[PDB]
Amino acid sequence: GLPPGPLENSSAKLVNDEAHPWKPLRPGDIRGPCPGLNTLASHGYLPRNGVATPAQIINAVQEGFNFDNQAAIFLTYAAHLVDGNLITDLLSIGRKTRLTGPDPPPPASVGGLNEHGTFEGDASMTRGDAFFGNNHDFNETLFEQLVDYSNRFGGGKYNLTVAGELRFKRIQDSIATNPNFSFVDFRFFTAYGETTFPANLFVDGRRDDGQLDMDAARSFFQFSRMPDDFFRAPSPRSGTGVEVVVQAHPMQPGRNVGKINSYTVDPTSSDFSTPCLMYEKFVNITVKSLYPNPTVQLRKALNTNLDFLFQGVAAGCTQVFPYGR
Ligand code: HEM
Ligand SMILES: CCCCCCCCCCCCCC(=O)O
Ligand SMILES: *[C@@H]1O[C@H](CO)[C@@H](O)[C@H](O)[C@H]1NC(C)=O
Ligand SMILES: *[C@@H]1O[C@H](CO)[C@@H](O)[C@H](O)[C@H]1NC(C)=O
Ligand SMILES: *[C@@H]1O[C@H](CO)[C@@H](O)[C@H](O)[C@H]1NC(C)=O
Ligand SMILES: *[C@@H]1O[C@H](CO)[C@@H](O)[C@H](O)[C@H]1NC(C)=O
Ligand SMILES: *[C@@H]1O[C@H](CO)[C@@H](O)[C@H](O)[C@H]1NC(C)=O
Ligand SMILES: [Cl-]
Ligand SMILES: [Mg+2]
Known part of the structure; x- marks a missing residue:
């Protein structure tokens, strides 16, 4: 399908409404590493089983949270290209599933958003x-660390100052304990953007003060549930304030080299100085x-979704064509 356009009416409004009630998971319902998509599925902005088309995802993030169009297009088509089924036009927001249809040949995995090292x-x-x-599952110990960092740096709330400190700690925790820690290219960029999302989109749009309370934080991160009477943001946005998170603790892209405490900078990796x-x-x-x-049909689907991905790329970049034009 064609990428949806921006909202005609981007005002704050009740999104936890009669047409979009929270419901618990049924057997087979899929939830994954993204609390935003998880919440949209659990309120029926997306199919409640967690399998959707790119156009459904873009419409849901705009309608439910006022995520901006360019960001919605970039992230959705990036996820779909690496994790979705390009022939059926379906993506799982979590685990690999037969519900995305017949698989392409190896080495493509169509693993859903749970697939490590593609988007996640x-x-x-x-x-x-x-x-x-x-x-992919919510982790109570890590959430309690988020609450502690909110108490220490945010007066009890999650804000961009908390994001800057927590983002760093999590990087340092992975360096100290994960011998395969990878923090380069796509993950390097998205990790920083994701830390702004709670402060920009999980805050009730009637306040839009960037201060997320821990009751609301738990509702979204653990239960994929909008607070009662949740109003979406009053204007389209995504990663505004990522500059504050990066400035808190500037990091170079790199990886552990098979051992803990071996973080080695990758000069071939992109960074914020090279977004194209x-x-x-x-x-x-x-x-x-x-x-x-x-094959012919897969090449056509790839080129179509790569054109859609390029719509989400910031002005200044040149489109690349791995399969020709
Ligand atoms: C537009 C399409 C979207 C896609 C394809 C997407 C995909 C993902 C994926 C795969 C992750 C896991 C990355 C990782 O932490 O390893 C993630 C994380 C996250 N996403 Fe989304 N996302 C989208 C939109 C949104 C929206 C609209 C919100 C908020 C309203 C959001 C909030 C988050 C947050 C807070 C995390 C980090 C979770 C954590 O680190 O604990 N995302 N997203
Ligand atoms: C992709 C980096 C995550 C930053 C969070 C804000 C979301 C913006 C989506 C990306 C839009 C342009 C991407 C690009 O120019 O490569
Ligand atoms: C836009 O939405 C607001 C509330 O979200 C509503 O008050 C207003 O009537 C809407 N405007 C249009 C174009 O219908
Ligand atoms: C949660 O994260 C903690 C801290 O990294 C880890 O020790 C634990 O094994 C994880 N899983 C669960 C189920 O608590
Ligand atoms: C986060 O909140 C705390 C306490 O109100 C404050 O010290 C800090 O400056 C805030 N940061 C932002 C981005 O508002
Ligand atoms: C280890 O890192 C590689 C990329 O460097 C990745 O392909 C692989 O999935 C990682 N494994 C785990 C479980 O972290
Ligand atoms: C990507 O491939 C195109 C040719 O299709 C080339 O012009 C461009 O330099 C390549 N970029 C990288 C980073 O390899
Ligand atoms: Cl927009
Ligand atoms: Mg992850």
Whole structure:
């Protein structure tokens, strides 16, 4: 389907409404590492079983949270290219499932958003690193660390100052304990953006003060549930304030080299000084390695979704064409 456009009416409004009640999971319902998508599925902005089309995801993040269009397009098509089924146009927001349809040939995995190292990655705030056995479920110990950092740096609330401190701690925790810790290219960028999302989109839009209370935080992160009478943000936004998080503790992209406490900077990795390189490497290396020699129908689907991905890329970058034009 074509990427949806921006909201016609982007005002704050009740999104926990009669048409979108929270419901508990049924057997087979899929939830994954993203509390935003999880909450939209659990309120029926997305299909409640957690399998959706890219267009459904873009409409849901806009309607439910006032996520901005360009950010919605970039993240959705990036996720779908590496984790979704390009022939059926379906993506799981969590585990791999037969519900995304017949699989493409190896080495493509169509693993859902749970797939480690495609979109999902290390030093998540409330989810453990994949090396420790579970990269998708809410983790109470990690959430209690978020509450502690909110008490120490946010007066009890999560805000961008807390984000800056927590983001760093999680990186340092992974360096100290995960011998396979990877923090380069796509993950490097998205990890920082994700820490702003609670302060920008989980805060009731009638306040929009960037101060997230811990009751609301737990509701979204653990139960995929909007607070009672939750109003969405009063304007489209995504990662505004990521500059504050980075400035708190500037880091170079890099990885542990098979041992703990061996963080080695990767000079081939993109960083905030090279955002177009991040896009080019995602397409020429990540997507191309999953689909090195696609058949006619897969090539067409890839090129279509790569065009859609480029719509979400900030002005100034050149489109790359791994399968030609
Ligand atoms: C637009 C499409 C979206 C996609 C494809 C997407 C995908 C993902 C994925 C795969 C992760 C896991 C990364 C990781 O931590 O390892 C993630 C994390 C996250 N997402 Fe989303 N997301 C989207 C939109 C949103 C929205 C609209 C919100 C908030 C309203 C949101 C909030 C978050 C948060 C807070 C995390 C971090 C969880 C943590 O570190 O504990 N996302 N997202
Ligand atoms: C992709 C970095 C995450 C930062 C959080 C804000 C979301 C913006 C989505 C990306 C839009 C432009 C991406 C690009 O120019 O490569
Ligand atoms: C836009 O939405 C607001 C509340 O969310 C509502 O008051 C207003 O009537 C709407 N405008 C249009 C275009 O219907
Ligand atoms: C280890 O890191 C590599 C990339 O460096 C990744 O492909 C692999 O899935 C990682 N394994 C775990 C469980 O972290
Ligand atoms: C949660 O994270 C903690 C701290 O990293 C870890 O020790 C624990 O094994 C994880 N899982 C659960 C189920 O608590
Ligand atoms: C976070 O809240 C605390 C206490 O109110 C404050 O010290 C800090 O400056 C706040 N940060 C932001 C971004 O408002
Ligand atoms: C991506 O591939 C295109 C050719 O399709 C090339 O022009 C560009 O330099 C490549 N970028 C990277 C980072 O490899
Ligand atoms: Cl928008
Ligand atoms: Mg993760």
